[model samples]
Target: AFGHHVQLVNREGKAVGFIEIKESDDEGLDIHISANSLRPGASLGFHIYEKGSCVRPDFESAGGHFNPLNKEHGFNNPMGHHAGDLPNLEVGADGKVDVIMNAPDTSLKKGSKLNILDEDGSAFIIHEQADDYLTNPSGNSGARIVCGALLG
Candidate 1:
């Protein structure tokens, strides 16, 4: 019952990356991310940088790593893996990565319980380095390379 206003952006901070988010009538939110920052031999992973908007240079505005339901760290931990917990985004010698994510519940519309626009919602972020996938805070992915927030 709403229009679409998904946004995308690519930039370089601690590293270089690309990101995009689109609204799908049936699939919900579709996310794409590609990043390269680690050393010659390093791996990357998917992550959710829960923030309302990207503040630039300092990605600190992105909130606490998508801590849905106030969960703890660790992807395979028994405690809990944040709802934003996603698979890894491996990097190549060419220093690049391609990631695709489909979030059936992600939205930016106003109202509704899941409304991202509510309280101005937050932005989805991608770090410069690899997320380790199994570690908390994503092992500090160097910098917050790419980011964007949904608007309505």
Candidate 2:
């Protein structure tokens, strides 16, 4: 199995967390997140965006979600859900989080539609709020507080 490591940093450039992702035997992806220094009792949302350019401070330069299939956002939508979509991240009062999740719809392969290692690469974003699981484009998840770029 092939894997990659993404080191997440907050807007202040502080190391906040890390995401370890491995390409499953199938087209799916297995991910584990270890977070620290997060807000207590915060519900965070994560997503993989199509670009890796975080040259700007706000991180809007990372582009939109990695929706190569042109599907609508949100996992609850019967008509759509981007491959980049994943479950929310829950932080405890201690401001730490450790969790693992599987994304059955995503991939790390170069040619796959859900691939995160595309030409422009991809980005993992940590939102400030929980995803409503049905909003288009983004999950109404407020402020992108942390971000990390994914590479091959």
Candidate 3:
């Protein structure tokens, strides 16, 4: 786990959330997320991208979702899902997001195809809408609302 963490921010560069990703001994990942003030009962698309930079306000600078596997987007896709395709976030009634997402695909270890800490590094991102769990090329999730560079 290089003790990786991500500090997400809005286009205005305001702190909107935090993400903590850890590699489990079980050969999986345990991702902790705490988000704020987006909307209640809404579904937000979240993912890890190929690049570590969130330099663009639209977050497009992070590049597409980390898809070395070239799999489809959506956690529930029957064919397969990208390692970067994370669960859609559910904003709580308290106007915040608190969730721990565990996926058995990616990890922090180097020299592995499933590595998130590759040469270009990785990033965390949240979209303006939900991931329908079926649509390709990113589940029709709208604009990128927030983004953060994955830090070591």
Give per-model TM-scores.
0.63, 0.91, 0.91
Candidate 3 wrong stretches, greater than 4 Å? none
Q: What is the lDDT of residue 103 in candidate 1?
A: 62
Better of 2 and 3 by TM-score: 2
Candidate 3 residues 1-152, lDDT tens each?
43576788888899987888778767678889988978778889888888888876788876888888787777677876888888888998877898888767887778888888787888888899998887888889998888888753
lDDT by residue (1-152, candidate 1, tens digit) is: 32333343445333355556667657656667655544444554455656667666665665766664677656667775666655656666876666667766556566644444556566666555666545556654566656666433
C-alpha root-mean-square deviation, candidate 2: 1.6
Per-residue lDDT value at 84 in model 1: 61
What would the per-residue lDDT of candidate 2 be over residues 1-152, giving only the tens digit for each residue?
A: 43588888888888887888877766488888888888899888988888976553678876898888898988898877988898898999999889877888787667877777777888888888899999888889988888888866
In the predicted model 2, the residue pairs found to clash are: none
Model 2 misplacement above 4 A: none
Model 3 sits at a Cα RMSD from the real structure of 1.8
Clashing pairs in 1: 44-89, 45-88, 45-89, 51-122, 51-123, 52-122, 52-123, 129-141
What is the C-alpha local distance difference test score of candidate 1?
A: 0.58
Clashing pairs in 3: none
Best by TM-score: 2
